[PDB]
Write a protein that binds this DNA or RNA. Structure first.
Ligand SMILES: [Mg+2]
Ligand SMILES: [Mg+2]
Ligand SMILES: [Mg+2]
Ligand SMILES: [Mg+2]
Ligand SMILES: [Mg+2]
Ligand SMILES: [Mg+2]
Ligand SMILES: [Mg+2]
Ligand SMILES: [Mg+2]
Ligand SMILES: [Mg+2]
Ligand SMILES: [Mg+2]
Ligand SMILES: [Mg+2]
Ligand SMILES: [Mg+2]
Ligand SMILES: [Mg+2]
Ligand SMILES: [Mg+2]
Ligand SMILES: [Mg+2]
Ligand SMILES: [Mg+2]
Ligand SMILES: [Mg+2]
Ligand SMILES: [Mg+2]
Ligand SMILES: [Mg+2]
Ligand SMILES: [Mg+2]
Ligand SMILES: [Mg+2]
Ligand SMILES: [Mg+2]
Ligand SMILES: [Mg+2]
Ligand SMILES: [Mg+2]
Ligand SMILES: [Mg+2]
Ligand SMILES: [Mg+2]
Ligand SMILES: [Mg+2]
Ligand SMILES: [Mg+2]
Ligand SMILES: [Mg+2]
Ligand SMILES: [Mg+2]
Ligand SMILES: [Mg+2]
Ligand SMILES: [Mg+2]
Ligand SMILES: [Mg+2]
Ligand SMILES: [Mg+2]
Ligand SMILES: [Mg+2]
Ligand SMILES: [Mg+2]
Ligand SMILES: [Mg+2]
Ligand SMILES: [Mg+2]
Ligand SMILES: [Mg+2]
Ligand SMILES: [Mg+2]
Ligand SMILES: [Mg+2]
Ligand SMILES: [Mg+2]
Ligand SMILES: [Mg+2]
Ligand SMILES: [Mg+2]
Ligand SMILES: [Mg+2]
Ligand SMILES: [Mg+2]
Ligand SMILES: [Mg+2]
Ligand SMILES: [Mg+2]
Ligand SMILES: [Mg+2]
Ligand SMILES: [Mg+2]
Ligand SMILES: [Mg+2]
Ligand SMILES: [Mg+2]
Ligand SMILES: [Mg+2]
Ligand SMILES: [Mg+2]
Ligand SMILES: [Mg+2]
Ligand SMILES: [Mg+2]
Ligand SMILES: [Mg+2]
Ligand SMILES: [Mg+2]
Ligand SMILES: [Mg+2]
Ligand SMILES: [Mg+2]
Ligand SMILES: [Mg+2]
Ligand SMILES: [Mg+2]
Ligand SMILES: [Mg+2]
Ligand SMILES: [Mg+2]
Ligand SMILES: [Mg+2]
Ligand SMILES: [Mg+2]
Lengths: 271, 46, 94
RNA sequence: GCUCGCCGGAAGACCAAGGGUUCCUGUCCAACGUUAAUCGGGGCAGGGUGAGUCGACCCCUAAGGCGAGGCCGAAAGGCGUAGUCGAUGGGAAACAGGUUAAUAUUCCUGUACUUGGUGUUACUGCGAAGGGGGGACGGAGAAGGCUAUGUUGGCCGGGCGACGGUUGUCCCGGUUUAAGCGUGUAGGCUGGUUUUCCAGGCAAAUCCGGAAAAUCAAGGCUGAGGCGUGAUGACGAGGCACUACGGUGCUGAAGCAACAAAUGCCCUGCUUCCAGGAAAAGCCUCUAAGCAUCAGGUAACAUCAAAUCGUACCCCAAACCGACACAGGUGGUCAGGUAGAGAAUACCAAGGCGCUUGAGAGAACUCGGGUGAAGGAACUAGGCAAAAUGGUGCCGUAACUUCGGGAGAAGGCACGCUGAUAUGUAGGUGAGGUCCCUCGCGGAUGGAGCUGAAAUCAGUCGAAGAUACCAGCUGGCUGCAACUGUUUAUUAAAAACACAGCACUGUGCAAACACGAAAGUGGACGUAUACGGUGUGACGCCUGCCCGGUGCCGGAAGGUUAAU
RNA sequence: AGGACCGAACCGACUAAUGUUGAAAAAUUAGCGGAUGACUUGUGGCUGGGGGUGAAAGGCCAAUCAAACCGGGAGAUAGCU
């Protein structure tokens, strides 16, 4: 539920919270946690590779089942939890044999529901079965690209992928970007949309809410010197040049894909 | 004012000490130059 | 068993002092200048063998050497080790 | 030595870092010390730092470093696996009193505690580099229970006042006591117990987890403080004696209660929020191979061991970083009284200082302040600077507005002391006593005693009662930027940057991109509600026309066109 | 509750005066801004010179920055003094 905050102060004037009362108000499941050390956007050479990253709140990593290999064994959904590592909420499920795991929470999933992986699984939101067993035209998420590798597509808070076709070993997908992509028909997929669809409805309100998320401020390029950026310089506000990267690459429109290995898997590009 | 030398023996020896010089190739060339010149204190290390 | 040769090279000298005379007459504790690498067990064995006397406990400390100036040339004296050897009651020593 | 003045949330005390003998005693005054110097952090000589419990070392790991092999690279070398280092964090245990010219949680007296050993005795499933648990974790806020500590009273000892008065509702001082052990409280958490089974925990498991069934609501865990013991002790005002007048020896009273009370403790708690809050070992437990009556295990007792290194002194400073005995800078800890919201401020205590040239005189001028007739910004680039306002409570408070604000708007009244209500009230605290009990650190009742605002009425003093220090000037129009923030260390703090938001565009994952001859790494243990770049810059109303030029995207019929 | 308010510690540095062979190679005095947050601080670590880092001033990188410092080429070259 989105809640507009009352303007008792600037910085609360424009804040929209996303309040979910179903999330667990306690500590997460400790065995499935591990350390997630921050980087600062710096590689093994110590240099900043990706900019604007730094700071933020400490985050523990939640081990999430994307491979979804417990076939045949049904599982009940114990509780829903918050994951700082990702936009979607996670679900703590309990298998019959006594194993607990974290999955991505689908849209309509709640505490007490039954999920089941495997080929003979039913078709309800939460089940994971190969797309040669999934009917054409359904919305799935957590989609594998390779069989047994683990789900890589449609993992963010409100996403889903439509299955538009199937030709033998392959199925054709309608990705969230609008791209039509071929995937082998033996790759697993999980039914339904991903949960937290109103994640994009939040408004941070203030700069600190981005510094909480580890997003350092972005200096725009024309506010620099010509040694710093191609856009820099000028006596006043001058920009008499085409918009490029900090490294002199055109940004407004120029394509950058140069992978001829996967061009056979792309049916149509996005528009 | 706060001046540029705020001493710490641990950081002094990790940065300029004997084993920090002997670790790398160029640091060993530093000790070879000071022996050829005949330095009494060859490094920082006490 | 600590060897007798080491026990002969452990002890250097008795230390004469106002504090040594006070501890000798009050706490029955002698103050010895010992070898620098000598440990407490080597000292207790040396006093218990070379003097044939019963040692209750040994406390040790390292004395840092002073920096002196002979003429105008700087110099530094040696670090030496000092032992408070507490004898048992009734024991006596010259 | 007697007076005076200063600090007193420090200009006092304790440390880390850092320094490295500056510590103490004797002696010297050449040099050093911004003067003299008999003095000194100066010279010279000697002395001084005592640990099973403090700390380090050590066991453990974080960021990160190194890195057998390995991969990569003209060479050097780069990255990185197994590993091994690496605190700023986790991990056993000691307190009080006394003493030195100088050390003490280190010595002494007293009373404890921990971990390892060997060795008997009883008992008998032991075993890991593996599994599980635990360690183990955020911010803010609210009280409640305490203590440190303080005040008053009581008590004990002393006193009866240089000047009117002071045998009293008088003055001064003291009234201290630990770790440990026992008790297990306020309070917090938790359902226990038994049996069966089980695609899970890489194999196993009696362990954990999960399914069942039965029985019992009541067992367990944690836990400040208090109380008892420690303690017939020690300490203790003072006396009694010798006295090298420095001291040394002997003796020693009372040692209680109430109230207030922390930012400290219970509290690693409780409530709540979103930005969702280290790891590993020690510790507990489970079994694997193995061992079979041996080994090992715990239980008691005895005995032995606990090494090595640091320990002086400054630490806010004359000893550290600043060339100086430099108005500078420097992390942690302790936090007395009166007033006060307060760690502000004023005056003081403990304690420590008077800042290493003085003596006069009392010109101009400069510096830092005080006061000022009449006028009151006429000064000036400009009300720069000064001056002024200043507290609590109550009344009251505009345009505009994003309905939060504006606003402490503005403006105004009261404020001391004494008495009465009430010989000190309401309230807080809570004793004796009595009663009950599944009995105790218990529950009622009870109100002694202590503490104690605020208000009203009457009176009274001064020119003045928020009397000192402390402590908003206010309002009107308008430009820019939404705001909080950031910035040219050392002439620019702004309208500049950033910002939340918006839009464009790239990117399908071995992502784009970036650092790297490369391997690789970041992006991201993320997956288009994501990430990168660019521009704009809250919000409200909006964002119109031009694709000719330059770019970018798409096209593939024709012309031209490279190596070959 | 708050990148909320007033205000000490703490962080900063808006104005004036002094000082300018200073007490000080940027400070003092009187006022000043923030002061639960995009806060501040200790210890240790990482990023290296056409490179780092940069809420972006060509700012900072040991009192040095429109390309640090040290050594070397090197007695660079100087139609200039
Ligand atoms: Mg960015
Ligand atoms: Mg932006
Ligand atoms: Mg920007
Ligand atoms: Mg600029
Ligand atoms: Mg350019
Ligand atoms: Mg212009
Ligand atoms: Mg133009
Ligand atoms: Mg020692
Ligand atoms: Mg005097
Ligand atoms: Mg005073
Ligand atoms: Mg003060
Ligand atoms: Mg000396
Ligand atoms: Mg001295
Ligand atoms: Mg003389
Ligand atoms: Mg002199
Ligand atoms: Mg001296
Ligand atoms: Mg250790
Ligand atoms: Mg280790
Ligand atoms: Mg490592
Ligand atoms: Mg190798
Ligand atoms: Mg390596
Ligand atoms: Mg440490
Ligand atoms: Mg001392
Ligand atoms: Mg474990
Ligand atoms: Mg926390
Ligand atoms: Mg008390
Ligand atoms: Mg009198
Ligand atoms: Mg009289
Ligand atoms: Mg009294
Ligand atoms: Mg006790
Ligand atoms: Mg000391
Ligand atoms: Mg001091
Ligand atoms: Mg001086
Ligand atoms: Mg000074
Ligand atoms: Mg006070
Ligand atoms: Mg005068
Ligand atoms: Mg005046
Ligand atoms: Mg006058
Ligand atoms: Mg006048
Ligand atoms: Mg007058
Ligand atoms: Mg007048
Ligand atoms: Mg005028
Ligand atoms: Mg004029
Ligand atoms: Mg002014
Ligand atoms: Mg004034
Ligand atoms: Mg104008
Ligand atoms: Mg602004
Ligand atoms: Mg501001
Ligand atoms: Mg600044
Ligand atoms: Mg400046
Ligand atoms: Mg300025
Ligand atoms: Mg990668
Ligand atoms: Mg702009
Ligand atoms: Mg337009
Ligand atoms: Mg065009
Ligand atoms: Mg084209
Ligand atoms: Mg052509
Ligand atoms: Mg604020
Ligand atoms: Mg100031
Ligand atoms: Mg403030
Ligand atoms: Mg410029
Ligand atoms: Mg500089
Ligand atoms: Mg350079
Ligand atoms: Mg150059
Ligand atoms: Mg040449
Ligand atoms: Mg020349």
């Amino acid at each position: 539920a989105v809640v507009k905050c009352k303007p008792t102060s600037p910085g609360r004037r424009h804040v929209v919270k996303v309040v979910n009362p179903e999330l667990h108000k306690g500590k997460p499941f400790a065995p499935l946690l591990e350390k997630n050390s921050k980087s600062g956007g710096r590689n093994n050479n110590g240099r900043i590779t990706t900019r604007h990253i730094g700071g933020g709140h400490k985050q523990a990593y939640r081990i999430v089942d994307f491979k979804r290999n417990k076939d045949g064994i049904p599982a009940v959904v114990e509780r829903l939890e918050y994951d700082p590592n990702r936009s979607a909420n996670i679900a703590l499920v309990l298998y019959k044999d006594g194993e607990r795991r974290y999955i991505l929470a689908p849209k309509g999933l709640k505490a007490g529901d039954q999920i089941q992986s495997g080929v003979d699984a039913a078709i309800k939101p939460g089940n994971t079965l190969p797309m040669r067993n999934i009917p054409v035209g359904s919305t799935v998420h957590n989609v594998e690209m390779k069989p047994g590798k683990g789900g890589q597509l449609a993992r963010s808070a409100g996403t889903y992928v439509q299955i538009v076709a199937r030709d033998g070993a392959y199925v054709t997908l309608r990705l969230r970007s609008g791209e039509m992509r071929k995937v082998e028909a033996d790759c697993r997929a999980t039914l339904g949309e991903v949960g937290n669809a109103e994640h994009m409805l939040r408004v941070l309100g203030k700069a600190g809410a981005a510094r909480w998320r580890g997003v350092r401020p972005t200096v725009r390029g024309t506010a620099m010197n010509p040694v710093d950026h191609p856009h820099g310089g000028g006596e006043g506000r001058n920009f008499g040049k085409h918009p490029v990267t900090p490294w002199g690459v055109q940004t407004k429109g120029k394509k950058t894909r140069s992978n001829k290995r996967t061009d056979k898997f792309i049916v149509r590009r996005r528009s | 004012m706060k001046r540029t030398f705020q001493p710490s023996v641990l950081k002094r020896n990790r940065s300029h000490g004997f084993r920090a010089r002997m670790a790398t190739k160029n640091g060993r060339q530093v000790l070879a130059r000071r022996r050829a010149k005949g330095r009494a204190r060859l490094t920082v290390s006490k | 068993m600590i060897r007798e040769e080491r026990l002969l090279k452990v002890l250097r000298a008795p230390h004469v002092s106002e504090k040594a005379s006070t501890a000798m007459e009050k706490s029955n504790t002698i103050v010895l200048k010992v070898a620098k690498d000598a440990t407490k067990a080597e000292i207790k064995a040396a006093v218990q063998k070379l003097f044939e006397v019963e040692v209750e406990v040994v406390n040790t400390l390292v004395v840092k050497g002073k920096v002196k100036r002979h003429g105008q040339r700087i110099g530094r004296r040696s670090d030496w080790k000092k032992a408070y050897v507490t004898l048992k009651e009734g024991q006596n020593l010259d």
